[PDB]
Design a protein around this ligand. Structure first.
Ligand code: NVP
Lengths: 546, 397
């Protein structure tokens, strides 16, 4: 097998892995394991033990027979290791090669030596009808043990180390028991380098498929088709049935959701509807007409092929964004007009209170971080907003906010400020002194207002709070008012929410206010402390407390 | 020799994840690390070391070459404990020096190394990270300055006997030296210290200017209802810090549901009320004393146009110091915010010799994507993200 320095392993402090008894098996298995084992025994993989070993994992036999072992126990008492990178390479950030070979080592774990010191801990056993006596223990990484992945990769990394320093024009990707190798050499040169690689590994005991057994490009990657110079979006097929269980529907959505990034115009609103109130996965829901519709429109869309290019470090990275509805954004990142590297969609973030500018800001933050990972760079942005609006928003917003280098792109619908609060009171404009209160034991509340022109109104609410009532008042004011208003409230809460000029929310109330707000021609909102002899306020303070 | 260091009882090594880095940065690391590797400062580690600490690259002040920076916050907080001249704060000028270099000379107890593990990432995870662990005293570790104190003092006595008028205070990787001297003699003499320091292996603030700034009230020719309301608001708040502040007379001017723009003539009583309040404010509220058994807190609000107000305190409304920060030439709330925190931390270091916990008016996502891009200190304080009340801001204006 392999001759690399084994890794020092130790059981979590204190813990030790003693015993999960053996599962007496039939006679057909007790011997179908006795066989496979004698094998490994010679290859040097497993070593007939017993001399001094109290530990033990249970062996199983599954339909070919083949053996499985439960370190489930062993593992949880095994120290933690340096995680296997689960952060993985995305097609959009790869550099076009002329060729890319893949070498499936396959039989690997069983090639790497186990930390002798620790092998004892691997002991397991084989049944025997009449239990009249088979004890073994691994000498190499066990298929199923906690540290096999980390310990293996690491060895792998160490074995290539030379090779790479020697062959910088070559690029290797290590994934699981796989190795993706590409280059810029010529068809024969590369072939030859692979061969070199192949034997180099065997010089270390790691077996790999030859040239007439290795798999061929394109290669499937987390959804894509990878050709060494380009990639294609795997065609996406949607089944056509007369029986659509909830399950069938969810998974469809799940599929469509994925396509929403690559493909333009996908919809799931009406398919999603069909799950409303579903009582079981196995339940059957007849697709509505609109459902049977978008689904079809989606099939048409899904036939289209999505071709894509790789990264060229000698060209600008550029990210352009679109507002595909409230809270919904689309983005495409390319280097050459229309030759996209990557595309995606960010779904409606439905929170307490924001606005497009804010929303846009987060979309941008998201693409940046994606980019810093994919390409280790920040794209030059092209946003559907005017430097003037961004200048207005930031210059006046209470929170640190930033947008890396960017450029306006006049591609409506544009992101704007649906309304702005006056900075000073409005002259001649009516003046509403509003207020609301609620009890802390009945949740009974009163909301209303009193104004200069005598006008007024109070109203009772049930099952509300201080903040819901206070908002209520502001709404009333916005209704029984002209196109220009001055509103004075005592609610720091109401204020702040509004002081931040929201244009989207999940509160029916707030939403309404917003609307009202966008409608008016001039609005100035003001704040005055709660219970004082402050004109107008002391007045409403009397009506919302009777 | 190696003084054995240990983690706080029952605590385990840091397992903090590595945020992604710019190409540029990563390279510089790969560069820097191969160097420290060759020199023995650090060694490559295996899969069995599960610990990990964040690292990045910076460019302190006017530098083309990058500086490796490791964020040992979690490690520090998990490291056992080890063991401030008020004179420092009470000086004309104070200069900061970077003695991090000194630590390389000292080896780290081999049993503690594992914890110091870190990683140089790769773009698109295209590659397995470059894992390292220190073999010496790392810069940024609360433990380094400590185990080095002994040798530090030594190398210092000389300058502390020659010039027993100046004060030398060390915080982490920084050395703070203060003298009531004049600049010409100051810039030249500091040089003298870096000279003495150089023959070993190493290489402009005014404290008498930091205080609790005064609240100022608006003064205007004429007053509208609005004007008066906003005034009472501010005053009302301010009453929490100065219970001497009264608003009766002003409240009266308002009695009635009048127009907001209506102009109101002031009463002799109201004008007194203001006069009296203005005076209650001409100074910081009595009895505000710093407590070492407690945590310093630094709160910052965004005033707009590049202005930022902040208050350092341990107990609410009892400010030890309050301030403002204008903007550094060269439209980036994050550079400004980062710059501000560094200013306020240094300032906090000088006075009380400890960093304040920051409450930042910004979104976690935003700050984490970029702060490291304008950071320039060897240290990193603690911070949390908040939502500035609409009021708190109008008040400190
Ligand atoms: C799956 C995968 C992950 C990371 N990189 C690669 C691959 N596989 C390829 O087929 C590939 C295609 C184009 C460019 N690099 C590629 N390779 C690099 C090795 C040449």
């Amino acid at each position: 097998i392999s001759p690399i320095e084994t890794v020092p392993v130790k059981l979590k402090p204190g813990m030790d892995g003693p015993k999960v008894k053996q599962w007496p098996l039939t006679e057909e298995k007790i011997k179908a394991l006795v066989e496979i084992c004698t094998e490994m025994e010679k290859e040097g993989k497993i070593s007939k033990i017993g001399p001094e070993n109290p530990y033990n994992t249970p062996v199983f036999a599954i339909k070919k027979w083949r053996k499985l072992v439960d370190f489930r126990e062993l593992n949880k008492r095994t120290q933690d290791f340096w995680e296997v990178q689960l952060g993985i390479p995305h097609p959009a950030g790869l550099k076009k090669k002329k060729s890319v070979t893949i070498l499936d080592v396959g039989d690997a774990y069983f090639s790497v030596p186990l930390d002798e010191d620790f092998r004892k801990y691997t002991a397991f056993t084989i049944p025997s009808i009449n239990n009249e006596t088979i004890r073994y223990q691994y000498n190499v990484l066990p298929q199923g043990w906690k540290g096999s992945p980390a310990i293996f990769q690491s060895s792998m990394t160490k074995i290539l180390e030379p090779f790479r320093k020697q062959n910088p024009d070559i690029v290797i990707y290590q994934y699981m028991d796989d190795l993706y190798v590409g280059s810029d050499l010529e068809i024969g040169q590369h072939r030859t380098k692979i061969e070199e690689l192949r034997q180099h590994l065997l010089r270390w005991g790691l077996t790999t498929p030859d040239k007439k057994h290795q798999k061929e490009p394109p290669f499937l990657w987390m959804g894509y088709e990878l050709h060494p110079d380009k990639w294609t979006v795997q065609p996406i097929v949607l089944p056509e049935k007369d029986s659509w269980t909830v399950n069938d529907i969810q998974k469809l959505v799940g599929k469509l959701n994925w396509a929403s990034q690559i493909y333009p115009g996908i919809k799931v609103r009406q398919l999603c509807k069909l799950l409303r109130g579903t009582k079981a996965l196995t339940e059957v829901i007849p697709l509505t007409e609109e459902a049977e519709l978008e689904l079809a429109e989606n099939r048409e869309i899904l036939k289209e092929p999505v071709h894509g290019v790789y990264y060229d470090p000698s060209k600008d990275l550029i990210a352009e964004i679109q507002k595909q509805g409230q809270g919904q954004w689309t983005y495409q990142i390319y280097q050459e007009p229309f030759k996209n590297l990557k595309t995606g969609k960010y779904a409606r973030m439905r929170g307490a209170h924001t606005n497009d500018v804010k929303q846009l800001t987060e979309a941008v933050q998201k693409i940046t971080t994606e980019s810093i990972v994919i390409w280790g760079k920040t794209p030059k942005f092209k946003l559907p907003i005017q430097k003037e609006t961004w200048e207005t928003w930031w210059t006046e917003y209470w929170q640190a906010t930033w947008i890396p280098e960017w450029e306006f792109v006049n591609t409506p619908p544009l992101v704007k400020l649906w309304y702005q609060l006056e900075k000073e009171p409005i002259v001649g404009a009516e003046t509403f002194y509003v207020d609301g209160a609620a009890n802390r034991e009945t949740k009974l509340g009163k909301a209303g207002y009193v104004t200069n022109r005598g006008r007024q109104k109070v109203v009772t609410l049930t099952d509300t709070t201080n903040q819901k009532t206070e908002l209520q008042a502001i709404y009333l004011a916005l209704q029984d008012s002209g196109l220009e208003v001055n509103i004075v409230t005592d609610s720091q809460y109401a204020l702040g929410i509004i002081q931040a000029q929201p244009d989207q929310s999940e509160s029916e109330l707030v939403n309404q206010i917003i609307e009202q707000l966008i409608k008016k021609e001039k609005v100035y909102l003001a704040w005055v402390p709660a219970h004082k002899g402050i004109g107008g306020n002391e007045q409403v303070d009397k009506l919302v407390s009777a | 020799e190696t003084v054995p260091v240990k983690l706080k009882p029952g605590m385990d090594g840091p397992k903090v994840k590595q945020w992604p880095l710019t190409e540029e940065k990563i390279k510089a690391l790969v560069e820097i690390c191969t160097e420290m590797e060759k020199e023995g400062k650090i060694s490559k580690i295996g899969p069995e070391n599960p610990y990990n600490t964040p690292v990045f690259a910076i460019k302190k002040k006017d530098s083309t070459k990058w500086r490796k920076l490791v964020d040992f916050r979690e490690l520090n907080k998990r490291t056992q404990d080890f063991w401030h001249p008020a004179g420092l704060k009470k000086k004309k000028s104070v200069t900061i020096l970077d003695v991090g270099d000194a630590y390389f000379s000292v080896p780290l107890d081999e049993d503690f190394r594992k914890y110091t593990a870190f990683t140089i990432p790769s773009i698109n995870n295209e590659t397995p990270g470059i894992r390292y662990q220190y073999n010496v005293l790392p810069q940024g570790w609360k433990g380094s300055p400590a185990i080095f104190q002994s040798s530090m003092t030594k190398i210092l006595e000389p300058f502390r006997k020659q010039n027993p008028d100046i004060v030398i205070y060390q915080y982490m990787d920084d050395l703070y030296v203060g003298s009531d001297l004049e600049i010409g003699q100051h810039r030249t003499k500091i040089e003298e210290l870096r000279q003495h320091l150089l023959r070993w292996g190493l290489t402009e603030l005014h404290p008498d200017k930091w205080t609790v700034q005064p609240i100022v009230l608006p003064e205007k020719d004429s007053w509208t209802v609005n004007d008066i309301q906003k005034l009472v608001g501010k005053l009302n708040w301010a009453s929490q810090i100065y219970p001497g502040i009264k608003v009766r007379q002003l409240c009266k001017l308002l009695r009635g549901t009048k127009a907001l723009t209506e102009v109101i003539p002031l009463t002799e009583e109201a004008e007194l009320e203001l006069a009296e309040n203005r005076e209650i404010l001409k100074e910081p509220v009595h009895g505000v004393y710093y407590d070492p058994s407690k945590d310093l807190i630094a709160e910052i609000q965004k005033q707009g146009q590049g202005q930022w107000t902040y208050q350092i305190y341990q107990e609410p409304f009892k400010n030890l110091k309050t301030g403002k920060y204008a903007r550094m030439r060269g439209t980036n709330d994050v550079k400004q915010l980062t710059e501000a925190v560094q200013k306020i931390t240094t300032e906090s270091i000088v006075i009380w010799g400890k960093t304040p916990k920051f409450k930042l008016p910004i979104q976690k996502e935003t700050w984490e994507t970029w702060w490291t891009e304008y950071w320039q200190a060897t240290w990193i304080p603690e911070w949390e993200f908040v939502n500035t009340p609409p009021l708190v801001k109008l008040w400190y204006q």
